[PDB]
Structures are given as structure tokens and as C-alpha cells.
Design a protein around this ligand. Structure first.
Ligand SMILES: Cc1cc2nc3c(=O)[nH]c(=O)nc-3n(C[C@H](O)[C@H](O)[C@H](O)COP(=O)(O)OP(=O)(O)OC[C@H]3O[C@@H](n4cnc5c(N)ncnc54)[C@H](O)[C@@H]3O)c2cc1C
Ligand SMILES: Cc1cc2nc3c(=O)[nH]c(=O)nc-3n(C[C@H](O)[C@H](O)[C@H](O)COP(=O)(O)OP(=O)(O)OC[C@H]3O[C@@H](n4cnc5c(N)ncnc54)[C@H](O)[C@@H]3O)c2cc1C
Lengths: 105, 105
């Protein structure tokens, strides 16, 4: 059984929350585990076509893990690629921090 | 900002969904990435006390990744440890597959 909407909202909540909690100056270790986290996520995400695309996205636009600001923007753009594919409106990445780090809306 | 309830429900949805999609006979690779996924998750989960505990849980009761049936039960019991800590009722792990693999309730 696949409930792709609830799984999708839940999973974006988790991804954007992890990027909002990420350091502005990450350790070399924090950078490496974030890259691996994201790669593995793309292998095991339980919505099979969802997974492969996001996995090609990670290969063609590698996660930017040098800081919170870069990672958050990266996530916002990864999510917007999926929004475009689904004919949903674009999210203003200028407001990624207001939404996910400060928690407004 | 930390909204631990929505983040928590979202994150359990993702974890139980990944275990429901896991093979009954996983490849050696699938086993290794699941272990690493879970370890990294426990490092980066954005609710700091939540994270450390679950990380000690993974060290004291290592993820059982040999099959879907074992992994799903493991996840159910990991979640029940947190339910106990929060004075929520215990979930019947006998019904883990009905809930998360078949999608009823
Ligand atoms: C990696 C991944 C790939 C997916 N691929 C597919 C797919 O191929 N086909 C499919 O049908 N579904 C896919 N899904 C599901 C889809 O993305 C949506 O989650 C689902 O349709 C639910 O949509 P929603 O309108 O409730 O909000 P969601 O798109 O899940 O958004 C949740 C909330 O995030 C905020 N938000 C929206 N856009 C952004 C952004 N760019 N940056 C930051 N915050 C934002 C908004 O506040 C929004 O309400 C995928 C999910 C994930 C995690
Ligand atoms: C790893 C982790 C650690 C956390 N630690 C804390 C913490 O220390 N303190 C804190 O306040 N919050 C913590 N949270 C949040 C907490 O677990 C809940 O998610 C949150 O309180 C929301 O509760 P809920 O009643 O909406 O349902 P949740 O507990 O999130 O459950 C979601 C749904 O899962 C199903 N379910 C319930 N139990 C099980 C089970 N054993 N197996 C399978 N399915 C089940 C039910 O259908 C339930 O509605 C943590 C979350 C995670 C992911």
C-alpha cells in the first residue's frame, strides 16, 4: 500500500526540518553524513518512481552541504522540481527559512 | 523552531513506511544502507533529546535488518519505547503490517 500524499508531506517535513537544524558551519563529519543520508533516502524512499527521479536529481545537482543556507536552498529547489512535475505552484525559496527554520506557516 | 508533534508523526510515518517497503529477503547492500540510514537518522533528527535517546536505543537494541518482518517489529518496538516514555498507549506490534504495509487505519 502506497499513500503517496501523506508520505510525501511527512517526508518533506522531515527533510526541510533536518536542513533547518543544520549548522551554518558544519563539521567535516556533519557534511559527510548529510550527503550519505540524502543518497540513502533516495534509494529507500517508498514510492518507487518518486525515488528514482530524486535519486537522478541528487546525481545531477549534488546536495550542497557546506552550510545551512546552501543546504536549505538546495532542498527548496529539489522540492520545487517535484512541484513543477506535479503542476503545483512554485515555493519562494527566499522564504524557506521563515517557513522551516522560524516555523511561520 | 521545534514543532515536535508534527515532526514526530511525520518522521514515524516515514520510518514505518520504509520498513513496510523493505524486502522479505534483503540484499547485503539493502541491509547495510538500512543500518546506516537509521544511525544517521538518529544523529540528525532535529529534536535534540529525542535524537540522543533514539541513538542510545539503536546502540542498545541494534536495528534488526534481516527481513521486513524483523525490521517492522524492530521499528514498532522502538516507537513503543517512545510511547512508554510519553505515557501514550502501547501499539500492538501484531498489527504493524496491517497498519503500515496494508494501510488500514
Ligand atoms: C523526495 C520526494 C519525491 C516525490 N515525488 C513525487 C512524485 O514524483 N509524484 C507524486 O505524485 N508525488 C511525489 N512526492 C509527493 C509530493 O511531493 C507531495 O508531498 C504530495 O503531493 C503532497 O503535496 P502537498 O500539497 O500536501 O504538499 P507538499 O509538496 O508535500 O509540501 C508540504 C509543505 O511544504 C511547503 N513547501 C512546498 N514547496 C516547498 C519548497 N520548494 N521548499 C520548501 N517548502 C516547500 C509548503 O508549506 C507545503 O505545504 C514526492 C515526495 C518526496 C519527499
Ligand atoms: C525517533 C523519534 C523520537 C521521538 N522522541 C520524542 C521524545 O523523546 N519526546 C517527545 O515529546 N516526542 C518525541 N517524538 C515524538 C512522538 O513520538 C510523537 O510522534 C508525537 O508526540 C506525536 O504523537 P501522535 O500521538 O500524533 O502519534 P505518533 O506517536 O507520532 O504516531 C503516529 C501513528 O503511528 C501509529 N503508531 C503508534 N505507535 C506505533 C508503534 N509502536 N508502531 C507502529 N505504529 C505506531 C499510530 O497509528 C499513530 O497514530 C519522537 C519522534 C521520533 C520519530
Amino acid at each position: 500500500h502506497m499513500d503517496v500524499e501523506q508520505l510525501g508531506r511527512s517526508s518533506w517535513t522531515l527533510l526541510h526540518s533536518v536542513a533547518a537544524s543544520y549548522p551554518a558551519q558544519p563539521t567535516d563529519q556533519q557534511k559527510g553524513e548529510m550527503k550519505q543520508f540524502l543518497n540513502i533516502f533516495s534509494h529507500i524512499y517508498p514510492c518507487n518512481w518518486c525515488a528514482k527521479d530524486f535519486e537522478k536529481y541528487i546525481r545531477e545537482n549534488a546536495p550542497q552541504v557546506e552550510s545551512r543556507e546552501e543546504l536549505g536552498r538546495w532542498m527548496c529547489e529539489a522540492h520545487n522540481k517535484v512541484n513543477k512535475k506535479l503542476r503545483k505552484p512554485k515555493f519562494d525559496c527566499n522564504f524557506w527559512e521563515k517557513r522551516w527554520k522560524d516555523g511561520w506557516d
